[PDB]
Amino acid sequence: SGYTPDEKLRLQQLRELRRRWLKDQELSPREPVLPSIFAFTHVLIPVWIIHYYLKYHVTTKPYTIVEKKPRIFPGDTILETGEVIPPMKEFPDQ
């Protein structure tokens, strides 16, 4: 139980044609085919354009970008005009 000689022979001639086809498929004719600027652009030019975009046009838009305020303390004064807050009271029972 195995091969029959027709299958053996037909197999062999297909082995030979597969040989020649695949060996033809590897071409090398010794000529197969024949016919910080980055940091500058990517951290200055969109930066320049967007900061040109973020003062003028977008601040002429009135309810544009809004900050959430820094959180003052009783031991803080204010940079803006300069006016102080009385400090936090007695500590005890620690």
Partner: protein, 87 residues
């Protein structure tokens, strides 16, 4: 992922792992010598041999093709058809 394959290297590997399996003889074990007709070992251990080649080379061979290997040269034929082992 770069395995290189060639004819006589894989003929060496098939012949080597048939030589390593014990209950055959290493004396009369030709490149084209049969399995059932001359070595005399039966069908079941022949399919264990086919299991060894599958477990070595990383692809199952089917039961439609498992009937008809019968000698190491035809095994190298079918594996070279599988991986397209020519230049």
């Amino acid at each position: 992922d770069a395995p290189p394959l060639t004819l006589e290297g894989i003929k060496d590997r098939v012949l080597y792992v048939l030589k390593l399996y014990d209950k055959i003889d290493p004396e009369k074990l030709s490149v084209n010598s049969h399995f059932m007709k001359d070595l005399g070992l039966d069908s079941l251990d022949q399919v264990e041999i086919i299991m060894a080649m599958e477990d070595e080379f990383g692809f199952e061979i089917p039961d439609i093709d498992a009937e008809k290997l019968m000698c190491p040269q035809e095994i190298v034929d079918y594996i070279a058809d599988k991986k397209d082992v020519y230049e």
